[PDB]
């Protein structure tokens, strides 16, 4: 992998592995999401790191508020997929990281993703707007003119997600993270929540449809000793669902989302 | 990745990923086990196989290879961003089945950082009945194996061939109600063998994991966990720290795996 010529974006190629694919012999959306995370990590390392001395001094970290992925073609087992990533400042709100996925052999865009990140105190979990001093330290690593993976003026990446009402049409209860679901800091990996959301989709939908779009909002973190319930209701050629992840006991919301599926 | 010059073994390099490491910023034993599986798959493809390593004779009789035992020893877990080189080969073990071995090395130093061995047996994919290999099938795979013995674990009467006892109730530690999600399934909708390693490790206390490093794991595979099954993971200290393990179905207590782990103080 490497930064591009202008040093404002990062590209990396990946060969799809045997254990990374589903029943269609193509990469699952969780493998794709892990690869997005990996190319994001490699981008931060290549530019010198994604926390500066100033963020480290104030105990601030970047946390994901929203993730939006659209896949036109899932790469097959043994195929090479090229992923390009970049960041852009969104004023005082936070930052946005975008991705473009391409088939390395044809050069055609097979997918795209966008994510919203906000600054949070590591210890108190309190959110805050971006200070001018912190924002100005990261601007030298972003393209200055807008560069959007989802340009469309009415794109599904910025749609507001409602809260699922009980009773849910489908459910998967008692979901718990194991050590493989944790990152190097013992926190639940963001991709695990995507897997948990998908667990409440019926197997018949998964067997006859392909996931085209997933939008996920992150409200609260699942701790290593928490238990989660995954709720889904059909809202809809295509099938659309509304999703909710909440703690098994008190019903505290951890995520909400939407998925769009197309017939195979 | 590629077959070596003699075409009797396969080598592949991997760069360790950010999501593949644990709290020590080194690859977990589950990432290592997935890489062993991946280099095994790439070896079968390189020697001509289009399912897993099944010849047309096995395909006509509906026979598949299934893991009976997995044994892994790690001296050093590769760090995040490091390149690890893995070499794999197979050997026929007469009529019993086959053995697949692996050697892990640090690509920069060339030193052996780990080794693994596994026992595979032939099974009918529909009835799940075990069978001897027979001359006709064994003779079709011999051209892909070294003829002289080549063992990742040469030592006479070593840890890889030790008999594992059945854990007696009550267990010292336990993790109950473990269930597979879609990410735990392979391309044939069966639970991936590496998930059972994760489930075994779930009943080790967090304090042991925080102060020790896993050096050895031996796992026997008795029965498969189905997509709608629920598993209990049981562990008792038998001692470094050594543990005896048992995975069984949550309800009727049917055994699915038994194993042992050996851990070294950090
Ligand atoms: N906040 C922020 C802005 C740009 C960039 C990063 C962080 S990075 O370090 O991940 C690569 C470029
Ligand atoms: N059964 C068996 C024996 C040798 C070899 C394989 C299978 S393979 O196809 O994985 C490569 C060598």
Q: How far apart are CA B242 and CA A11, in angstroms?
A: 44
Helix then strand count (H, E) for chain A reads 5, 12
Q: Which residues line ligand 2 (CB under 6 A)?
A: B 43-44, 47, 49, 53, 90, 98, 141, 144-145
Residue B25 backbone phi and psi in degrees, to 5: 60, 30
Please state, in angstroms and as integers, the Cα–Cα distance from residue B156 to each residue in B22, B98, B162, B197, following that order.
34, 19, 11, 26
- The structure's method of determination equals X-ray
Q: How far apart are CA B28 and CA B72, in angstroms?
A: 12
With CA atoms as reference, report the closest residue to A93 among A57, A134, A54. Answer: A134
Task: Quote the minimal CA–CA distance from A229 to chain B in Å.
Answer: 13
Task: Quote the minimal CA–CA distance from A152 to chain B in Å.
Answer: 32
Q: Which residues line ligand 1 (CB under 6 A)?
A: A 43-44, 47, 49-50, 87, 95, 138, 141-142
User: Which ligand places an atom closest to the C-alpha of A55?
Assistant: 1
Q: How far apart are CA A29 and CA B64, in angstroms?
A: 29
Q: Find the CB nearest A23 among B25, B28, B189.
A: B189
Report the DSSP beta bridge partners of residue B79. Answer: B26
Residue of B118, B144, B146, B147 to mutate, ligand 2, most atoms within 8 A of C-beta: B144
What residues contact residue A91 under an 8 Å CB cut-off, 6+ apart? A130, A135
| DSSP three-state, residue A195 | helix
- Would you tell me how many other CB atoms lie within 10 Å of the CB of residue B126? 8
The residue contributing the CA closest to ligand 2 atom 10 is: B44
Q: Tell me if residue B188 is catalytic.
A: yes
Q: Find the CB nearest B37 among A19, A25, A37.
A: A19
The secondary element (H helix, E strand) that includes residue B93 is: strand B83-93
What residues contact residue A241 under an 8 Å CB cut-off, 6+ apart? A201, A232, A233, A234, A235, A258, A259, A261
Q: Find the CB nearest A178 among B37, B182, B198.
A: B198
**DSSP code of residue A69:** E
The secondary element (H helix, E strand) that includes residue A136 is: helix A132-138
Q: Are A190 and A255 in contact (CB under 8 A)?
A: no
Q: How far apart are CA B47 and CA B8, in angstroms?
A: 9
Q: How far apart are CA A35 and CA A20, in angstroms?
A: 11
The residue contributing the CA closest to ligand 1 atom 7 is: A50
Data resolution in angstroms? 1.8
Size of chain A in residues: 264
With CA atoms as reference, report the closest residue to A193 among A33, A19, A28. Answer: A33
The secondary element (H helix, E strand) that includes residue B89 is: strand B83-93
Q: How far apart are CA B217 and CA B118, in angstroms?
A: 12
- In chain A, residues with a C-beta closer than 8 Å to the C-beta of B186 are 19
Task: Quote the minimal CA–CA distance from B183 to chain A in Å.
Answer: 7
Q: Please, what's the b/e burial string for B127-137 (b: 16 or more CB within 10 A of its CB; e: otherwise)?
A: eeeeeebeeeb
In chain A the beta strands, taken as DSSP E runs, fall at 2-3, 10-15, 60-71, 80-90, 94-103, 109-121, 127-128, 170-175, 209-218, 228-234, 238-247, 253-263
**DSSP code of residue B130:** E
What domains appear along chain A, each with residue ranges and CATH number?
A: 2-156 (3.10.129.10), 170-263 (3.10.129.10)
Q: What is the CA radius of gyration of chain B?
A: 18
Report the DSSP beta bridge partners of residue B231. Answer: B178, B249
């Amino acid at each position: 992998g490497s930064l591009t010529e202008d040093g404002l974006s990062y590209k990396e190629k990946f060969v799809v592995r045997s254990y990374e694919v589903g029943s269609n012999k193509t990469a699952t959306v969780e493998t794709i999401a892990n690869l997005l995370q990996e190319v994001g990590c490699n981008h931060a390392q290549s530019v010198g790191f994604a926390t500066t001395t100033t963020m480290r001094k104030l105990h601030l970290i970047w946390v994901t508020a929203r993730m939006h992925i659209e896949i036109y073609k899932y790469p097959a087992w043994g195929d090479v997929v090229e992923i390009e990533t970049w960041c852009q400042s969104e004023g005082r709100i936070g930052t946005r990281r975008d991705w473009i996925l391409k088939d390395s052999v044809t050069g055609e865009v097979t997918g795209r993703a966008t994510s919203k990140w906000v600054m949070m105190n590591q210890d108190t979990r309190r959110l805050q707007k971006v200070s001018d001093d912190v924002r100005d330290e990261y601007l030298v690593f972003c393209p200055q003119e807008p560069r959007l993976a989802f340009p469309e003026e009415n794109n599904r990446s910025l749609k507001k997600i409602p809260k699922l009402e009980d009773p849910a049409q489908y459910s998967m209860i008692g979901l718990k993270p194991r050590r493989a679901d944790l990152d190097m800091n013992q926190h639940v990996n963001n991709v695990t929540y995507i897997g948990w959301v998908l667990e409440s989709i019926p197997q018949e939908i998964v067997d006859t449809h392909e996931l085209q779009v997933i939008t996920l909002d992150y409200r609260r973190e699942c701790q290593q000793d928490d238990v989660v319930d995954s709720l889904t209701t059909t809202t809809s050629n295509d099938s659309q669902f509304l999703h909710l992840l909440r703690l098994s006991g008190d019903g505290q919301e951890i995520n909400r989302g939407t998925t769009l599926w197309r017939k195979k």
